[PDB]
Ligand binder design. Structure first.
Ligand SMILES: Nc1nccc(-c2c(-c3ccc(F)cc3)ncn2C2CCNCC2)n1
Ligand SMILES: N=C(N)NC[C@]12C[C@H]3C[C@H](C[C@H](C3)C1)C2
Ligand SMILES: [Ca+2]
Ligand SMILES: [Ca+2]
Ligand SMILES: [Ca+2]
Ligand SMILES: [Ca+2]
Ligand SMILES: [Cl-]
Length: 344
């Protein structure tokens, strides 16, 4: 049995195994807070997330289970996964805290594009990695739905992982079907976000920096043009349909005149991502085959996910049932090998 120690971090007590040393706060995460740490077992740097009040209500309890199940399933180099999961609890009766461990990623995408004019080759690599991770999570019928630079973790060598998938926020990267609440959408909501992110990496400017939902919609329509009646099919609110229908008709812009000086292959990819019709939007797997990524693309190294059983999502269980199921998942966790890759 590991010896734990207590340390106050972010004005609360963390209780962690001696294995993890030199904890230092590196910001909030989804439903928790995160500390960097040194794993004395492997000499690796890790990030430890302590969930906040994981069993306070059935909402917290189910999202705790959801997140632990999801992270236990994710095994991809561009997707956050688990090195460890622990609790100071000695039994289910004591079980009230959950800590999740992953490799340390020092930055997010906003740290990369802020004070640096990125080269096109570097933008290619960053977007390629997002799409590789999206192909994987999408293959398991998991969608991010709120992909944005602050949800892309990046290390010192621009290696990137998607986080907080499948779970006041900026809406500047959200797919229009999400932001304004369409009755049905698909996995390519995330591809819209990639388009917005890529545009910003190329120009240094946020593509659609709207001040409210209506201002953001008008910015979007100025670029991609007014939608046809067909897309009104997806909007339930009559007042919203009436408003959009009421707008003066706008032509789609030629993206080549918007992204002056960009790689023409980048402009072509943006044209395929930033389309209002989500059934016309390029998929992650299709985008990986686009010539923009030719120097990185490798079909042998763009894997899909094992099937993921989400049948628990339709079920209402009691707090103590979610808590016991979560405890089961903590105890059954099998840490991965330190080295899980081989030369191609
Ligand atoms: N520094 C770093 N490195 C890796 C991940 C995170 C992380 C996690 C997280 C998720 C699961 C897990 F098991 C452990 C940590 N959640 C939010 N963040 C963010 C903390 C600051 N914003 C960017 C990343 N932070
Ligand atoms: N001000 C910005 N950074 N973006 C707003 C934009 C700029 C141009 C491309 C699209 C459409 C239209 C012209 C309005 C987005
Ligand atoms: Ca390769
Ligand atoms: Ca190896
Ligand atoms: Ca490596
Ligand atoms: Ca090969
Ligand atoms: Cl599974």
């Amino acid at each position: 049995r590991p010896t734990f120690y207590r340390q106050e971090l972010n004005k609360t007590i963390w209780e962690v195994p001696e294995r993890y040393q030199n904890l230092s706060p590196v910001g909030s995460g989804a439903y928790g807070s995160v500390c960097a740490a040194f794993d004395t077992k492997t000499g690796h740097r890790v990030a430890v997330k302590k969930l906040s009040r994981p069993f306070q209500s059935i909402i917290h309890a189910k999202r705790t289970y959801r997140e632990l199940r999801l992270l236990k399933h994710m095994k991809h180099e561009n997707v956050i996964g688990l090195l460890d999961v622990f609790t100071p609890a000695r039994s289910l009766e004591e079980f009230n805290d959950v800590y999740l461990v992953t490799h340390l990623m020092g930055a997010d995408l906003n740290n990369i594009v802020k004070c640096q004019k990125l080269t096109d080759d570097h933008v290619q690599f960053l977007i390629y990695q997002i799409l590789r991770g999206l192909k994987y999570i999408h293959s398991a019928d998991i969608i991010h739905r709120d992909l944005k630079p602050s949800n892309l973790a990046v290390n010192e060598d621009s290696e990137l992982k998607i986080l907080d998938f499948g779970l006041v926020a900026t809406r500047w990267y959200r797919a229009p079907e999400i932001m304004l609440n369409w009755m049905h959408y698909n996995q390519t909501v995330d591809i819209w976000s990639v388009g917005c992110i890529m545009a910003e990496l190329l120009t240094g400017r946020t593509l659609f920096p709207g001040t409210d939902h209506i201002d953001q919609l008008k910015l979007i329509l100025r670029l991609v043009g007014t939608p046809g009646a067909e897309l009104l099919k997806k909007i339930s609110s009559e007042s919203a349909r009436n408003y959009i229908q009421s707008l003066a008709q706008m032509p789609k812009m030629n993206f080549a005149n918007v992204f002056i000086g960009a790689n023409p292959l980048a402009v072509d990819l943006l044209e395929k991502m930033l389309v209002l019709d989500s059934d016309k939007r390029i998929t992650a797997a299709q985008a990986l085959a686009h010539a923009y990524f030719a120097q990185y693309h490798d079909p042998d190294d763009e894997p899909v996910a094992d099937p993921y059983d989400q049948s628990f999502e339709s079920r209402d269980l009691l707090i103590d049932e979610w808590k016991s199921l979560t405890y089961d998942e903590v105890i059954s966790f099998v840490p991965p090998p330190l080295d899980q890759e081989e030369m191609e």
